[PDB]
Structures are given as C-alpha cells and as structure tokens.
Design an enzyme around this catalytic site. Structure first.
Site: not given
Ligand SMILES: NC(N)=Nc1ncc(Cl)c2ccc(S(=O)(=O)N3CCC[C@@H]3C(=O)O)cc12
Length: 257
Positions: A55, A106, A205, A207
């Site tokens: 991704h 992924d 970040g 990922s």
């Molecule tokens: N671990 C956890 N808990 N959340 C996340 N884990 C891994 C990744 Cl790579 C990401 C990336 C983005 C987000 S986020 O919170 O920035 N985001 C953007 C897409 C949907 C999600 C959100 O707003 O809920 C959370 C995680």
C-alpha cells in the site's frame, strides 16, 4: 556474515537506536528536487531483499524513484555506518485489495542494490531478520516489537526525528472479529496486536515496518504494519500482514523466477 534476528548487545513509548532493530529499512522517495521524502518502513530479509507493505508504493509504482536506507535511526539526517541502496526490483502483491479501512494481501518485496552494484553487508547496525517457517506463528498473548518513524499522536502533522519502538501484545483472530473491535474486516491472513491497556500502538507512517516476535529462540518477522482505526484507541488494535501465510509468495518471487 549475516545471522538473522540477533542484535549486537508509534504512539508507543520509546526512542531507540538502529542496533536495537538492525533489520529496519527506511524507505524514501526521490523528488524534483531532491528532496527525498520518507515513505514507509521495511525489514531486511537477505542481503538483497527488503520486505514491506504494497500500500506504500501503490501511488508511485516507479522503482527508480526509491531509496532504501539500512543502519539509519534518524528521519532526515545521517547515521554513522548507514548504507544507501536503490531499488532494481519492486514487486507488489497481485491480490492486494482495500476498502476504506482494511488492506488485504498487504505485502511487498524490494530487491536492493547500491550505486556501486553491491548488496547489503553485515555490521553492528545492519542485520537480517528471520522469516517464520510454513505454518508456525507465535501463539496469542506473545509480546512482540513494533518499530517505525510513524506519528506519535494521530492528529500530529509532524513525525519524530528519532526512530521509535514499542511492545504490543498479540490478540486472537476471534477477539479481533468481535463487533466492538473489527468484525469481519479482519481475516486469518492478518494478526491483531495491541496494548491491554490501549496506550501504545502503531500509527500513520509506521506502514510496512516490522512486527518482531521471538519464536523458539529466533527473532522473527511475524507481521508487517498494515492498518488500523485511529491510533491507540480502545478495542481498535493495530492489524498486521501475517507473514507466514505468504512464504510461497516470497519464495516464488525471491529465489530465481
Ligand atoms: N494501529 C492503529 N490503531 N492504527 C494504524 N495502524 C497502522 C497504520 Cl499504517 C495506520 C495508518 C493510519 C492510521 S490513521 O488513524 O491515520 N487512519 C487513516 C485511515 C483510517 C485511519 C483512521 O482515521 O481511523 C492508523 C493506522
């Protein structure tokens, strides 16, 4: 020579050095420029192979744009002993899929090579990680390590300048599938991992980066940071690609063909 998984002796809670996570690969993108900007985490497999998440590369699929660093613990400045590579092979998983939250399949592989045509060489700061073997994974409740340059709070526009790491506890597929958690968003090709607790986690970040667990001695690449709802929220753990489910895929794409 390389001995996988052994060191030379993130909402999360801890800044680190690279010898604490010596298989961590930091993946950047060449710009205009330049003007290399951080893209994703990775993990060193063998001297010529880094593994990350598909991704990450989906919006810029040109291999010639990428830069991988090994032995780096700073986001935007250099680390004594760091090693810089280019990507001569970028392979994405052809069954990759997403909806608005979850990413399926992924996983990605990068064949690395330096300007002087060299593969990676071992040091105090650069080291392979071990793959799981076919079928065995850590069992739930096992405490595992996640490392990354990801956001420190989900609302930040800034990322940390020092590599972070934390410990997170593996959740059962069945508990992750509870309505209050992820339901059927989560599959058996993913692993959930959170804090009891809900105070430490992966985030934007992070990922592609390592979820490391110790199995049977060896420090092993059990998961690849993939997705989650929010960051360090209650009943919303981080979700990782289950690397074991993919060894035929790694082997089929890594060895020759
Ligand atoms: N671990 C956890 N808990 N959340 C996340 N884990 C891994 C990744 Cl790579 C990401 C990336 C983005 C987000 S986020 O919170 O920035 N985001 C953007 C897409 C949907 C999600 C959100 O707003 O809920 C959370 C995680």
């Amino acid at each position: 020579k390389f001995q996988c998984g052994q060191k030379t002796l993130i909402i999360g809670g801890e800044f680190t050095t690279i010898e604490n996570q010596p298989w961590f690969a930091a993946i950047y993108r060449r710009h205009r420029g330049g003007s290399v900007t951080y893209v994703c985490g990775g993990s060193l497999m063998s001297p010529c192979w880094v593994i990350s998440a598909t991704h990450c590369f989906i919006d810029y699929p040109k291999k010639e744009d990428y830069i991988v660093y090994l032995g780096r613990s700073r986001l935007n400045s250099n680390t004594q002993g760091e090693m810089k590579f280019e990507v001569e092979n970028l392979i994405l998983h052809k069954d990759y899929s997403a909806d608005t939250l979850a990413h399926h399949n992924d996983i990605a592989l990068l064949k690395i090579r330096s300007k002087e045509g060299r593969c990676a060489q071992p040091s105090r700061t650069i080291q392979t990680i071990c793959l799981p073997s076919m079928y065995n994974d850590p069992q739930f409740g096992t405490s595992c390590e996640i490392t990354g340059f990801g956001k420190e709070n989900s609302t930040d526009y800034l990322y940390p300048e020092q590599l972070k790491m934390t410990v997170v506890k593996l959740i059962s597929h069945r508990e992750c599938q509870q309505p209050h958690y992820y339901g059927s968003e989560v599959t058996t090709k993913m692993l959930c991992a959170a804090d009891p607790q809900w105070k430490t986690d992966s985030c934007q970040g992070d990922s592609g980066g390592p979820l490391v667990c110790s199995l049977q001695g060896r420090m092993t690449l059990t998961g690849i940071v993939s997705w989650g709802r929010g960051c360090a929220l209650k009943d919303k753990p981080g979700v990782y690609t289950r690397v074991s489910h993919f060894l035929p895929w790694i082997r089929s794409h890594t060895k020759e063909e």
